[PDB]
């Protein structure tokens, strides 16, 4: 019986034990999705990297044979997602409009603001006193506030858009997903319309001006790009901050090193990215045959990338299952690779460094406020992260 994919984690920062056979099937195995369909899983580092660079894999989920890992997804997959869900040459043209807003230089220039936002968040936690619920108090507002400012979406609407984002990603039913998407779409169409008559500051305003008013894009494409950036902007980073904190608290000795040597923080973020691999199960379909690792992925077969197992490939990383700040994590695929490699990674690094580093610098007593194995975390059919994170100090 193939391993069923995906499955819930049991320890939120490790691959599930049910993936043990995938660890031994490297670089490539087969797996069963929810409707019984059989597809390729990619489990080796070298093969992941080859394949994520191969224009013979498609990310367009509207293709007839594109794999669906949930019923919910199967239902919405008749609609394209801008950028992430588009192939070259169109992917390329979209990316180019966005890239200037997401440079390393832009990220470095935002750091003072990131630092101030984090300081204000930890200040409020400290004013209210422990315990705190770290996801809602910190891990979520930092990146939500930041992407709102960067995009020109008002953080004042965060309760609405965060709520709809959750329903959108998680459902659980088709109806929840369609309702969330409609509410978000209508919110974003109104926003864009408002911005057309009275421009603000923000990437969305730049896209309207420098793109739409050239005829280079339309409004639906903007809504799609805006949804993708708003959601990836806040969800991925919040999950990295919350799961990162949880992981660090459960590895006292690695945490103590970062405490002594804060200069390690960039390397720790990169290692936390590899070790946690929250964006697990990336989806493609072959549109032509691809020979790889001595077999052939054939046209129309589903291909799923088991990011977590890949980033624990010993060929990729010595002692891959150790959390370590000194063995390079460079070349991990937690931000993907090739064509769709994370647009927001420069920003995401600055956020995680500043947030995690300041958190532990400022609340040196920090610790879990409930038993570890009672703290809820997200299921395996979505991007991994804590749902809550009770802490004290
Ligand atoms: C820890 C934080 C993050 C992680 C782990 C993460 C992970 C990923 C991964 C794995 C991909 C590739 C998806 C695939 O190939 O199917 C991706 C793409 C993307 N990320 Fe992130 N990301 C993070 C933060 C962010 C942030 C802050 C943004 C901000 C807007 C963002 C925007 C995107 C976009 C737009 C893409 C699509 C790129 C393309 O299609 O060309 N990400 N990211
Ligand atoms: O999947 C959907 O229908 C919702 C949607 C709408 C617009 C843009 C992106 C997305 N979903 C979505 C997002 Cl929000 C982030 C990463 C990957 C995907 Cl498929
Ligand atoms: O990029 C894909 O193939 C879709 C996919 C599958 C599993 C896990 C994560 C992602 N994408 C995705 C990203 Cl890249 C950022 C935020 C939220 C989501 Cl759902």
Compute, in angstroms, the gap from residue 138 CA to the centroid of ligand 2: 24
Ligand 2 touching residue 181 (CB < 6 A): yes
Count of structural domains within the chain: 1
Ligand 1 touching residue 142 (CB < 6 A): no
Length of the chain in terms of residues written: 393
Which residue in this structure is represented by tokens 């945490």? Answer: 255
Q: How far is it, in rounded angstroms, from Cα 147 to Cα 153? A: 8
SS3 call for 147: helix
Alpha-carbon distance values, 191 to 161, 195, 217, 385 (Å): 12, 6, 16, 29
Given the CA of residue 168, which atom of ligand 2 is nearest to it?
4
Compute, in angstroms, the gap from residue 237 CA to the centroid of ligand 1: 10
What residues contact residue 388 under an 8 Å CB cut-off, 6+ apart? 133, 134, 135, 136, 375, 376
Contact 33, 381 (CB under 8 A): no
Q: How many CB atoms lie within 10 A of CB 107?
A: 18
Contact 133, 374 (CB under 8 A): no
Compute, in angstroms, the gap from residue 257 CA to the centroid of ligand 2: 38
Ligand 1 touching residue 331 (CB < 6 A): no
What is the DSSP secondary-structure string of 20-40? HHHHHSTTEEEEE-TTS-EEE
Compute, in angstroms, the gap from residue 335 CA to the centroid of ligand 1: 6
Would strands 38-42 and 302-305 be described as parallel, antiparallel, or unpaired?
parallel
Q: How far is it, in rounded angstroms, from Cα 144 to Cα 175? A: 25
Q: What is the resolution of this structure in A?
A: 2.2
What residues contact residue 156 under an 8 Å CB cut-off, 6+ apart? none
Query: What is the chain's alpha carbon radius of gyration, rounded to the nearest angstrom?
Result: 21
Given the CA of residue 235, which atom of ligand 3 is nearest to it?
16
Contact 66, 302 (CB under 8 A): yes
In which domain, by residue range, is 29 found? 1-393
Half-sphere exposure in the Cβ direction for 270 (13 Å, CA): 15
Ligand 3 touching residue 381 (CB < 6 A): no
E strands, the chain, are 3-4, 28-32, 38-42, 57-58, 132-133, 282-286, 290-292, 295-297, 302-305, 367-368, 390-392
* Residue 350, Cβ density class (10 Å: 0-12 exposed, 13-18 middle, ≥19 buried): buried
Which residue in this structure is represented by tokens 């890992």? Answer: 69
CA 112 to chain centroid, in Å, comes to: 23
Given the CA of residue 334, which atom of ligand 1 is nearest to it?
10
Compute, in angstroms, the gap from residue 306 CA to the centroid of ligand 2: 19
**Residue owning the nearest CA to atom 19 of ligand 3:** 383
What residues contact residue 370 under an 8 Å CB cut-off, 6+ apart? 390
Contact 96, 102 (CB under 8 A): no
Contact 26, 275 (CB under 8 A): no
E strands, 50-123, are 57-58
Ligand 1 touching residue 303 (CB < 6 A): no
Compute, in angstroms, the gap from residue 81 CA to the centroid of ligand 2: 6
CATH number at residue 308: 1.10.630.10
Residue 40 pairs with which residues in a beta bridge?
30, 303
**Residue owning the nearest CA to atom 18 of ligand 3:** 383
Does the annotation place 148 within a ligand binding site?
no
Pocket probe mutation, ligand 2, options 147, 227, 236, 280, max atoms within 8 Å of Cβ: 227
Pocket probe mutation, ligand 3, options 40, 336, 383, 385, max atoms within 8 Å of Cβ: 383
């Amino acid at each position: 019986a193939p391993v069923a994919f995906p499955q819930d984690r049991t320890c939120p920062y490790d691959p599930p034990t049910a993936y043990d056979p995938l660890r031994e099937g490297r670089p490539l195995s087969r797996v069963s999705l929810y409707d019984g369909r059989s597809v390729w899983v990619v489990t080796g580092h070298a093969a992941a990297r080859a394949l994520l660079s191969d224009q013979r894999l498609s990310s367009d989920r509207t293709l007839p044979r594109f794999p669906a890992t949930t019923e919910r997804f199967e239902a919405v997959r008749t609609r394209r997602v801008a950028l992430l869900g588009v192939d070259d040459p169109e992917h390329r043209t979209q990316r180019r409009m966005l890239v200037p807003s997401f440079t390393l230089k832009r990220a470095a220039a935002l750091r003072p603001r990131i630092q101030e936002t984090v300081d204000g968040l930890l200040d409020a936690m400290e004013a209210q006193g422990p315990p705190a619920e770290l996801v809602s108090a910190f891990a979520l507002p930092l990146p939500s506030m930041v992407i709102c400012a960067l995009l020109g979406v008002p953080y004042a609407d965060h309760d609405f858009f965060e709520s709809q984002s959750r329903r959108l990603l998680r459902g659980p039913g088709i109806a929840e997903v369609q309702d969330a998407r409609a509410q978000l779409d209508d919110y974003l169409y109104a926003l864009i319309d408002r911005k057309r008559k009275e421009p603000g500051d923000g990437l969305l305003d730049d896209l309207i001006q420098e793109q739409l008013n050239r005829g280079t894009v339309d409004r639906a494409e903007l809504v799609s790009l805006a949804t993708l950036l708003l959601i990836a902007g806040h969800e991925t980073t919040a999950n990295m901050i919350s799961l990162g904190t949880f992981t660090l608290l459960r590895h006292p000795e690695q945490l103590a090193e970062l405490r002594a040597e804060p200069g390690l923080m960039p390397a720790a973020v990169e290692e936390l990215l590899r070790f946690l691999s929250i964006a697990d199960g990336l989806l493609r379909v072959a549109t032509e045959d691809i020979e790889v690792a001595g077999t052939t992925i054939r046209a129309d077969e589903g291909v799923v990338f088991a990011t977590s197992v890949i980033n624990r490939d010993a060929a990729g990383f010595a002692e891959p299952d150790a959390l370590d700040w000194h063995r390079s994590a460079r070349h991990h695929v937690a931000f993907g690779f090739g064509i769709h490699q994370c647009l927001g990674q420069n920003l995401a690094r600055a956020e995680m460094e500043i947030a995690l580093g300041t958190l532990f610098e400022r609340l040196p007593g920090l610790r879990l406020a409930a038993p570890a194995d009672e703290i809820p975390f997200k299921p395996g059919d979505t991007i991994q992260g804590m749902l809550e994170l009770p802490v004290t100090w």
